[PDB]
Amino acid sequence: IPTVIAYDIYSRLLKDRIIMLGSQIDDNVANSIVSQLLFLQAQDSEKDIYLYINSPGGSVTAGFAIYDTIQHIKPDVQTICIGMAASMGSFLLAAGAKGKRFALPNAEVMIHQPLGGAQGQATEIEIAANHILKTREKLNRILSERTGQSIEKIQKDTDRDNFLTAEEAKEYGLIDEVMVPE
Amino acid sequence: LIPTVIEERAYDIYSRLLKDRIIMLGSQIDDNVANSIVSQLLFLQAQDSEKDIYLYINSPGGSVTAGFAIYDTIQHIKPDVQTICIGMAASMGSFLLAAGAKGKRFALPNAEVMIHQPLGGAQGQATEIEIAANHILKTREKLNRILSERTGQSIEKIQKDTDRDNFLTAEEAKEYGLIDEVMVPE
Amino acid sequence: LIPTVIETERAYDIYSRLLKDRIIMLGSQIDDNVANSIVSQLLFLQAQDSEKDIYLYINSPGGSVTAGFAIYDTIQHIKPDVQTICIGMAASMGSFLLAAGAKGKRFALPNAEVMIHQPLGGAQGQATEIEIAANHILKTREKLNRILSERTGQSIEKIQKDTDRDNFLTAEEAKEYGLIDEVMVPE
Amino acid sequence: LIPTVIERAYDIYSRLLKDRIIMLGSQIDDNVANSIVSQLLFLQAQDSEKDIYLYINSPGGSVTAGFAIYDTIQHIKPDVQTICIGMAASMGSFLLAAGAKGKRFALPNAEVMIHQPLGGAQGQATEIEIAANHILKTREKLNRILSERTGQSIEKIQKDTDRDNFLTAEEAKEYGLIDEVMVP
Amino acid sequence: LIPTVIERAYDIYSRLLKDRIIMLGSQIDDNVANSIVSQLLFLQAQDSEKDIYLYINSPGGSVTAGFAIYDTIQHIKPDVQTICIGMAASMGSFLLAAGAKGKRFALPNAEVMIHQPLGGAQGQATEIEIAANHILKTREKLNRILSERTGQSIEKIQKDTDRDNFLTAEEAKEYGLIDEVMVPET
Amino acid sequence: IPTVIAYDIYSRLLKDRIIMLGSQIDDNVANSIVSQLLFLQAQDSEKDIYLYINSPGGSVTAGFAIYDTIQHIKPDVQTICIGMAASMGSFLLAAGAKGKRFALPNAEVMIHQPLGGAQGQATEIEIAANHILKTREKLNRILSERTGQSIEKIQKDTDRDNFLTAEEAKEYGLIDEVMVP
Amino acid sequence: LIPTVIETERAYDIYSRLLKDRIIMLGSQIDDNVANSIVSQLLFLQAQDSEKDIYLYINSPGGSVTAGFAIYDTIQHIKPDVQTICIGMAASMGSFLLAAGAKGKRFALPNAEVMIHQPLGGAQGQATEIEIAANHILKTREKLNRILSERTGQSIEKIQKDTDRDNFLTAEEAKEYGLIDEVMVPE
Amino acid sequence: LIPTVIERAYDIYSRLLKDRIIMLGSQIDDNVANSIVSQLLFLQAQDSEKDIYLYINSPGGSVTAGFAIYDTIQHIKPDVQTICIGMAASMGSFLLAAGAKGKRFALPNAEVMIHQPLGGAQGQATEIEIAANHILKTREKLNRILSERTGQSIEKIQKDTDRDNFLTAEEAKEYGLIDEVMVP
Amino acid sequence: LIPTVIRAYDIYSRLLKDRIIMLGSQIDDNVANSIVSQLLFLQAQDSEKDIYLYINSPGGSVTAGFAIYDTIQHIKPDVQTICIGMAASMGSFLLAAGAKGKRFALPNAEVMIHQPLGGAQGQATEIEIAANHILKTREKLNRILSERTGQSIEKIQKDTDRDNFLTAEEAKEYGLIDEVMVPE
Ligand SMILES: CC[C@H](C)[C@H]1C(=O)N(Cc2c3ccccc3cc3ccccc23)C[C@@H]2N(C(=O)NCCCC(F)(F)F)CCC(=O)N12
Ligand SMILES: CC[C@H](C)[C@H]1C(=O)N(Cc2c3ccccc3cc3ccccc23)C[C@@H]2N(C(=O)NCCCC(F)(F)F)CCC(=O)N12
Ligand SMILES: CC[C@H](C)[C@H]1C(=O)N(Cc2c3ccccc3cc3ccccc23)C[C@@H]2N(C(=O)NCCCC(F)(F)F)CCC(=O)N12
Ligand SMILES: CC[C@H](C)[C@H]1C(=O)N(Cc2c3ccccc3cc3ccccc23)C[C@@H]2N(C(=O)NCCCC(F)(F)F)CCC(=O)N12
Ligand SMILES: CC[C@H](C)[C@H]1C(=O)N(Cc2c3ccccc3cc3ccccc23)C[C@@H]2N(C(=O)NCCCC(F)(F)F)CCC(=O)N12
Ligand SMILES: CC[C@H](C)[C@H]1C(=O)N(Cc2c3ccccc3cc3ccccc23)C[C@@H]2N(C(=O)NCCCC(F)(F)F)CCC(=O)N12
Ligand SMILES: CC[C@H](C)[C@H]1C(=O)N(Cc2c3ccccc3cc3ccccc23)C[C@@H]2N(C(=O)NCCCC(F)(F)F)CCC(=O)N12
Ligand SMILES: CC[C@H](C)[C@H]1C(=O)N(Cc2c3ccccc3cc3ccccc23)C[C@@H]2N(C(=O)NCCCC(F)(F)F)CCC(=O)N12
Ligand SMILES: CC[C@H](C)[C@H]1C(=O)N(Cc2c3ccccc3cc3ccccc23)C[C@@H]2N(C(=O)NCCCC(F)(F)F)CCC(=O)N12
């Protein structure tokens, strides 16, 4: 990670209100991004924030930490998908400010149902199944609100792995514009 | 080392017991144990359709489907299959103990009987976890329904009493309806 | 430990004694070894008597599709009716072989579990290698679904839909589906 | 890499601590407890009157480490606000409920889970007995405090924590674990 | 390798079984219990009145597997003599004490050890509680029987089995675990 | 990593608009290079950027993160292959500014088809197969545009591992000139 | 992830800032490295001021007995009173050090856990080697129990009995026992 | 690959057992003790007067397993001759000395080793104490019996077994562990 | 692996019927126990007729080797030794131990001689005991080699200091064998 005159490259980007979601989403990544969003709001509550997304997703709860923080703060959080947005990464891509969700032409967007595990007694498995099913209902309802697609459509389209191009993601309502070279 | 006995005709001890219509369920229940026991049951009813069979149970249970292989074979064949719990009957072992011929389910005085929920697991997509959950819940309802029929307890009582690990003495198993008599020394 | 029995005085292991009365055991995961044994037993029994029925016990989670088709083709070629009986569970290629038994002689005991689902596999390497592997397993599924349609009387369209995910059936549901003919009830 | 901010260079979490914000964003072990307790002590010394803000995104962990944080919160003069962002499970949800009365929050999609303590024991029958009595007393201790913090009966807490019990933010408010669901 | 003897070929242990001698010469698990129980049942069927001789060189093991052997000994008509050779520890010493009254022996340098049951528990507090209650009940069951067969109080048995308690053959006789130290003919 | 008078060697190069792609391409490497590209264009949108490429390739999506960032920004991004460029590395070599794609005489260039895997149900294998086949068409279509070769020729020449010299890479259209001493 | 704090300027990591106000953290398993650090901090603080109290925070499951006695002996030698405060838990040699604080200045917060038990160890080899190891750990227990008796006011016989097995105590029970002087109740 | 002798077919060791020869040719564990004890019981039942021959090529092992064999040898009526061929170490040497008085042998290059018992202990101080007292009492037991078998004092045995003590066949005869060195 | 020949015999048991013993493996206690038992069986059948010891072995345990050695020297029958393939370490010692004038090797058979291998770990006095033991074992081996080859102890010491490979002809000249058996 190179230095620029004294900032590391990512910290220099943060000076211009740019946050990097460039890894698998766990609690540590969520804690950092939430802290960055809170800091940028405190500096200036009016100016836009830019969330770079190159992520395969990961933890749903960690994703919702980022999601809820985005929606609470006053500044518009722009989202731009560069490389790939999968699973909870694509959920956060769709969570960006209305009209300011982007993807570069060859960026990959994938949507699919949440993954999990359960082990032990029948009633413990039932509790785990009800939890992940309710979690999917929560994700689908919000994605419906964000994309303009129905919950029934999102349910069917996320049953298996569903890879989308940048243009297909725009047509779906996950992003607003495919950002072309000027 | 399984010992040999000579009656001339040499027998390993378990095969000698099988000659007198005795089957040993003395291990964890998997498909191999089920295949052996159902084959022994088929052989014995073919040899004699009237004479009782004796099923020894010292088992911590295991596979539910492997257990139901043994269960269904016991109920289909004409001979009464007596069950005797010696040492311990846990989980699907206690289910098979309760599945013996009415009036011929036994345990020795210090034998341990345990009943609880079916165990399992699932990993992957939410809909895959749902399928696994529905399957194991249906499997529990199936087991509890049969236990209710075999013991005379209500399905609601079986559900409550199998929620956690429930250890029973031989006398408690008799009171519950899992066995008919605690076998005492003469 | 497989127990021994004596017919008074020829000694047999329990499974060999069953084979004397035309009973073959499919009681494990289906691999090439299990297929070779079952194919050899079927060829032996039909050579002894081409008219008497053979009885195939099925307590199996399935396994290799090619090994399953070794057993399937042998069953269909030989003259004797091969009866099938599901005891415990028949999953995947085990349930396929359950449905492959002689017409009107496919059975399950009341608490036996039958599961149907699409074939499993894997592929790794170049895109064209993944394509070949994908085309192979899709063609294998169509092959399985077409034969299962013939044996059950259900459509290829229905079988495709019903085998998309793991589909557990009771013995009575398996009868309704056409995978078996009768649920064997106790007297 | 944790990002830096310069205005004096700060890592992002240390910059938040300057404005009386403490992060509980991991599994609770002794190291996390020692850090949070030290931060609370420091913030009390800096300003005994201004509120402290405890961010909670944690699956819980050690009960004793959790009680290190709990007791420090209750001792110090400043109110400690708690805010659940992402998820609060087990001892994390206990600490969420331990925030200053009227100042316990959760964001709308945050997850709260409550259940009984986990543990293990191995060896002699009397050694297993000691371990069982200890974890049972620890559960009574936790349930008694949770009853006081939520206003629910100990009997209800016992029943509701027997198995894994997932709650929405609104359900956590209705239960008494938090005071308000913070809306955008 | 187990040596063969020909009078009709026998492995050495099978030859001993012909004279009503059963070998408990290993750690007690379900397999060992299944074998010993089957041998006892076979010997009772052969002769319901002649004594059986149970050799014990064992560190113990499974309590439920031990109780399979224990209950089978007490049910059958023939007296089961017990002889400790080498060592009897834990459930091995319990079975030594379970022999027919007046027919429990040890050789002069044989080692007897008694202690409390060993086990484990993991998971939720209520699951640990169930596991703890179970092992405590199992110890009560063992101590009550040991009290009956030694003549010692349950209070004394509890205290003396709190830790590993090694006894000589002579101390085991004094305690009531055996009846006589079998001395060599000079 | 030595220091120079105070900059580490790679940071000193970044001051003269030089970016180093000297490793396997994963998301971390892509995030760093994308950030460096965005930094340099913000400093100066007119002056050229020099992308050093010594890489065996790696993730296709991580590669396309770098690719799209290069094409979007105003500055010409020169590409110089030193040592080796394989797979996605050779794709990024061909993605440099027109007339400013270079390789040193003994630099190695390799092209082949994308690598991947799939495991599970037949329909899951089908989805994975369709995805990687679409990814190959995407790569081959862009490589056809950058090199001037037909898609049918790219398909044939990338079927197996195809090693090229620097001069062969110039002939193929992957680079513009072999930079002589 | 240890946070930094700045005061107008001078930057400190949180634990170094606490050390500036004579606070030492025993917040881990006790090994030689932890003992070396704490002994060095104690020596530093007494050199800075021989009269002002030192505050020893204890959240520790214990560990090495010799490493514990390095801390114990340093505490007793230096002139300043070393206050001890149990927060979270003090087990084994951690609870021994809790009891070693200045008379009247040993504290615990209300929900802090205190545990006392026997020294743990092991030995493998010859009978005489096992004898040496046994005599050593027994002598170490006598040494620990004698000091505990002195600092708690309980008899050595009572300490022996109560430390035979794992003995968990509440903060209040630890006060009644004499391991601490006061439970710090919140205002 | 144990060779067959016809072859009436016999494996070589079973053929030797027909002429009252028992092989102690491995590490002594409970399995080896059970077999040897069973063979001794079989041979005395066949003939209580004729001698038994115990071949010893063993590094020893379990003390309790060794005492199973020891007590069985002393109880039965037949004289049990012992012959050390190759090596007798630890409990193997103890059983060599346990043979019938006047009928304990070794071949000229056979190795005899004596040393104190080995063991372990782990856990609480009182558990280590119990383990220590047990292994010490076992050493006293071994030394007392070895004193009876050899005619050497317990005090001498203690000192001579403090460390590993290798003896030649002639030195073992001088010690009283054997009676004669068998020459060609 | 081992084929049958027809009374049915496995190939090695058939060879034992004509007084042929196979030392075709690494020498451990199990191999020694079998070979000494075979030697005891053959001399019991006939004390006059020769025994033939096939040797294709890399050596191994010295004590297990001396179990075989002492048994060879004690019994009445001449034990012929023939090296086929290779005799290394204690295998070459046993090759030299064959009856005088009846020790053989085939033309391309390999014979290797070298000093004993071992290990020691622990206290200085424990290392001393182990060192004295293996040094005394070397003197024991070298003294017997000297007697059976005709070479001096000083020469055996020097020639076995490192690994010393010998041809069949060199082994004859050294005194380890009596003749290189030629094809007729
Ligand atoms: C939108 C946040 C509110 C203003 C409110 C709040 O809800 N919260 C709760 C809250 C968090 C609290 C702690 C850690 C992360 C938090 C993230 C939040 C995200 C959304 C809403 C509230 C959050 C705290 C916030 N604080 C600051 O941001 N302080 C300024 C320091 C910022 C920086 F420069 F240090 F970065 C502390 C004081 C305060 O009232 N709030
Ligand atoms: C109760 C058995 C039925 C009468 C019926 C049957 O349902 N089945 C199906 C069936 C099984 C079939 C194969 C393997 C196991 C089986 C177990 C069954 C259990 C219950 C019911 C049927 C079973 C087969 C049975 N066979 C034998 O038992 N033959 C005698 C075998 C003797 C010996 F070999 F056992 F000695 C083959 C002929 C036959 O009609 N049946
Ligand atoms: C149905 C069998 C056919 C008549 C034909 C055949 O197609 N085949 C081909 C064939 C197989 C050939 C080899 C191994 C397995 C085979 C399985 C087959 C299954 C179905 C059809 C042919 C099979 C061989 C068969 N053979 C035997 O069965 N011989 C008797 C074997 C008796 C015993 F050993 F079983 F007891 C050899 C002679 C022969 O003509 N055939
Ligand atoms: C509420 C704190 C009390 C006033 C008291 C105390 O109870 N304790 C005990 C105590 C702790 C002691 C050490 C480490 C952590 C502690 C956490 C505590 C939590 C609650 C109560 C007491 C604690 C210590 C406190 N110290 C400081 O905080 N000093 C100020 C410097 C703080 C910083 F800036 F350095 F952070 C040292 C002097 C002192 O008397 N106390
Ligand atoms: C004490 C045995 C009872 C008489 C009764 C019984 O309670 N049981 C139950 C029972 C067991 C049953 C199966 C396996 C083990 C058993 C062990 C038992 C131990 C104690 C009491 C009953 C046991 C079975 C017994 N059987 C035999 O022993 N048959 C003789 C053949 C023995 C051998 F020679 F084959 F060994 C079968 C007939 C029968 O009625 N019983
Ligand atoms: C090409 C940049 C566009 C003009 C636009 C944009 O599309 N984006 C989106 C965008 C990214 C956003 C975040 C992180 C990486 C990004 C990479 C991009 C690559 C290509 C196109 C847009 C990118 C951001 C850009 N920002 C800066 O670069 N700001 C100054 C950067 C200075 C410094 F920090 F580097 F020093 C923030 C404001 C802004 O308008 N944009
Ligand atoms: C109580 C200390 C004694 C007065 C004496 C001593 O016994 N010792 C021995 C002694 C130790 C010596 C070295 C390391 C640790 C020590 C810990 C001790 C604990 C108790 C008693 C003596 C110790 C050394 C002490 N030194 C300092 O502390 N020097 C001051 C520097 C302090 C700091 F700032 F550097 F920390 C060096 C000179 C000196 O005479 N002593
Ligand atoms: C010296 C043996 C005594 C006579 C006595 C005895 O003490 N015991 C106890 C005893 C053992 C008992 C069981 C197993 C092993 C035993 C080993 C013993 C060793 C020494 C002394 C008693 C032993 C049993 C002996 N039995 C036989 O040997 N029976 C003949 C069996 C011959 C054959 F099977 F080997 F061929 C069974 C009856 C019996 O009274 N005893
Ligand atoms: C040379 C052997 C002596 C004659 C003597 C003896 O020294 N010993 C001691 C001795 C051994 C004893 C047991 C096992 C192996 C032995 C190997 C020996 C090797 C050398 C010398 C004595 C050995 C035993 C020998 N026995 C037999 O060989 N019995 C016949 C065996 C026939 C058959 F089984 F082999 F076929 C038992 C009786 C006996 O007096 N001896």
Site to substitute for ligand 9 among H12, H13, H18, H19, most atoms within 8 A of C-beta: H19
Query: Residue C16: which of C8, C4, C28 has the closest Cα?
Result: C4
The residue assigned the tokens 């969003």 is A37
Please give the Cα distance from I31 to I22 (Å, whole number). Answer: 10
Beta bridge partners of A20: A52
Quickly count: other Cβ atoms within 10 Å of residue C120's Cβ.
16
Contact A44, A73 (CB under 8 A): no
Q: Say whether D42 and G14 touch across the interface (CB within 8 A).
A: yes
Please give the Cα distance from G123 to G130 (Å, whole number). Answer: 6
Contact I134, I119 (CB under 8 A): no
Q: Which of I34, I71, I129 sits opposite H85 (nearest CB)?
A: I71
Q: Which amino acid is at G4?
A: T
Instruction: Determine whether A148 is exposed, middle or buried from the number of CB atoms within 10 Å of its CB (0-12, 13-18, 19+).
Output: exposed
Question: How many CA atoms, within 13 angstroms, populate the side-chain half-sphere of residue A152?
Answer: 0
What is the three-class DSSP state of H115?
A: coil
Tokens of E149: 């067969």
Tokens of B17: 């017991």
Q: Say whether B121 and A121 touch across the interface (CB within 8 A).
A: no
DSSP H61: B
What separation in Å is there between the alpha carbon of B174 and the centre of ligand 5?
A: 20
Strands G4-7 and G10-13: antiparallel
Please give the Cα distance from A104 to A81 (Å, whole number). Answer: 7
Please give the Cα distance from E90 to A1 (Å, whole number). Answer: 63
**From atom 11 of ligand 1, which residue's Cα is the shortest distance away?**
D55
Please give the Cα distance from I177 to I184 (Å, whole number). Answer: 19
DSSP for chain I? -PPEE---EEHHHHHHHTTEEEE-S-B-HHHHHHHHHHHHHHHHH-SSS-EEEEEEE--B-HHHHHHHHHHHHHSSS-EEEEEEEEEETHHHHHHHTSPTT-EEE-TT-EEEE--------SSHHHHHHHHHHHHHHHHHHHHHHHHHH---HHHHHHHTSS-EEE-HHHHHHHTS-SEEPPP-
**What phi and psi, each to the nearest 5 degrees, are found at residue A143?**
-60, -35
Strands B181-182 and B105-107: parallel
Q: Which amino acid is at H58?
A: S
Please give the Cα distance from I13 to D5 (Å, whole number). Answer: 85
The residue assigned the tokens 């391991």 is G179
Please give the Cα distance from G89 to D68 (Å, whole number). Answer: 8
- Interface residue ranges in chain A relative to chain D, Cβ cutoff 8 Å: 1, 6-8, 10-11, 14-15, 27-28, 30-32, 34-36, 38-39, 42, 61-62, 64-65, 67-69, 71-72, 123-124, 127-128, 131, 134, 138, 142
Tokens of H16: 């030797």
Tokens of G95: 């609870």
Please give the Cα distance from A13 to A3 (Å, whole number). Answer: 12
Residue G184 alpha carbon, nearest atom of ligand 4? 21
Residue C21 alpha carbon, nearest atom of ligand 2? 34
Tell me the technique behind this structure.
X-ray
Q: What is the rounded radius of gyration, in angstroms, for the C-alpha atoms of chain C?
A: 18
* Neighbour-count burial for B18-53, b at 16+ CB within 10 Å, e otherwise: bbebbbbbbbbbebebbbbbbbbbbbbbeeeeeeeb
Helix axes B126-151, A122-147, angle to 10 degrees: 150
Strands (E), chain F: 3-4, 7-8, 18-21, 49-55, 77-86, 101-103, 108-111, 115-121, 162-164, 177-178
Instruction: Determine whether G6 is exposed, middle or buried from the number of CB atoms within 10 Å of its CB (0-12, 13-18, 19+).
Output: middle
Contact A34, D110 (CB under 8 A): no
* Neighbour-count burial for B82-109, b at 16+ CB within 10 Å, e otherwise: bbbbbbbbbbbbbbbbbbbbeebbbbbb
Q: Which ligand is nearest to the CA of E183?
A: 8
Contact F131, A86 (CB under 8 A): no
Q: Which of D41, D75, D134 sits opposite G184 (nearest CB)?
A: D75
The residue assigned the tokens 């280590």 is H128
Closest Cα in chain D to E119: D123
Please give the Cα distance from D108 to D170 (Å, whole number). Answer: 7
Q: Which amino acid is at E57?
A: N
Instruction: Determine whether A180 is exposed, middle or buried from the number of CB atoms within 10 Å of its CB (0-12, 13-18, 19+).
Output: exposed
The number of residues in chain E equals: 186
Query: Residue F60: which of A81, A102, A178, A108 has the closest Cα?
Result: A108
Contact E167, E113 (CB under 8 A): yes
Instruction: Determine whether H145 is exposed, middle or buried from the number of CB atoms within 10 Å of its CB (0-12, 13-18, 19+).
Output: buried
Distances (CA, A) of D166 to C139, D90, D125: 44, 10, 34
Please give the Cα distance from F138 to E115 (Å, whole number). Answer: 73
Tokens of G103: 């008379």
Q: Say whether B13 and E70 touch across the interface (CB within 8 A).
A: no
Catalytic option among F23, F59, F112, F144? F112
Start-to-end CA span in chain I (Å) = 31
C145 lines ligand 3 (CB under 6 A): no
Tokens of B177: 């309806």
Distances (CA, A) of H171 to B163, H87, H111: 71, 14, 10
- What residues of chain D lie within 8 A of the CB of A62, using their CB? 57, 86-87
Cα torsion through H26, H28, H30, H31, rounded to 10: 10
Strands (E), D31-150: 52-58, 80-89, 104-106, 111-114, 118-124
* Neighbour-count burial for F85-121, b at 16+ CB within 10 Å, e otherwise: bbbbbbbbbbbbbeebbbbeeebbbbbbbbbbebeeb
Question: How many CA atoms, within 13 angstroms, populate the side-chain half-sphere of residue E54?
Answer: 32
Contact E37, E29 (CB under 8 A): no
Quickly count: other Cβ atoms within 10 Å of residue A16's Cβ.
11
Contact A35, D13 (CB under 8 A): yes
Tokens of E21: 């001698």
Beta bridge partners of F163: F110
Helix axes F27-43, F60-72, angle to 10 degrees: 10
The number of residues in chain D equals: 184
Contact B60, C34 (CB under 8 A): no
Resolution (A): 1.8
Please give the Cα distance from A49 to E114 (Å, whole number). Answer: 73
Closest Cα in chain H to I74: H184
- Interface residue ranges in chain H relative to chain G, Cβ cutoff 8 Å: 115-126, 128-129, 131-133, 135-136, 138-139, 162
Distances (CA, A) of E135 to C126, C171, F19, H149: 58, 41, 67, 46
**From atom 13 of ligand 6, which residue's Cα is the shortest distance away?**
A52
Query: Which residue of E27, E31, E36, E41 is the best one to mutate when testing the B interface, meaning the one whose CB has the most B CBs within 10 A?
Result: E41
Please give the Cα distance from A68 to D86 (Å, whole number). Answer: 8
G21 lines ligand 4 (CB under 6 A): yes
Tokens of D10: 């700060």
- What residues of chain C lie within 8 A of the CB of B29, using their CB? none
Quickly count: other Cβ atoms within 10 Å of residue C96's Cβ.
24
Q: Which ligand is nearest to the CA of C49?
A: 3
Please give the Cα distance from E15 to E13 (Å, whole number). Answer: 5
DSSP F180: -
Strands G10-13 and G23-26: unpaired
H90: left (phi over 0), alpha (psi -120 to 50) or beta: left
Site to substitute for ligand 8 among H41, H47, H74, most atoms within 8 A of C-beta: H41
Q: Which ligand is nearest to the CA of I38?
A: 9
Please give the Cα distance from B163 to C180 (Å, whole number). Answer: 35
DSSP F23: S
Closest Cα in chain G to D63: G88
Distances (CA, A) of C70 to E113, I122, I135: 59, 63, 67
Strands F7-8 and F108-111: unpaired
Distances (CA, A) of C28 to B30, H1, I73: 10, 34, 58
| Cα three-residue angle G40-G44-G46, rounded to 5 degrees | 120
Q: Say whether A132 and B139 touch across the interface (CB within 8 A).
A: no
DSSP for A71-117? HHSSS-EEEEEEEEEETHHHHHHHTSPTT-EEE-TT-EEEE---EEE
DSSP for A21-63? E-S-B-HHHHHHHHHHHHHHHHH-SSS-EEEEEEE--B-HHHH
What is the three-class DSSP state of C80?
A: coil
Q: Which of E4, E86, E182 sits opposite H14 (nearest CB)?
A: E4
Map out the domains of chain B with their CATH numbers.
13-182 (3.90.226.10)
Q: Say whether C130 and F112 touch across the interface (CB within 8 A).
A: no
Residue H54 alpha carbon, nearest atom of ligand 9? 13
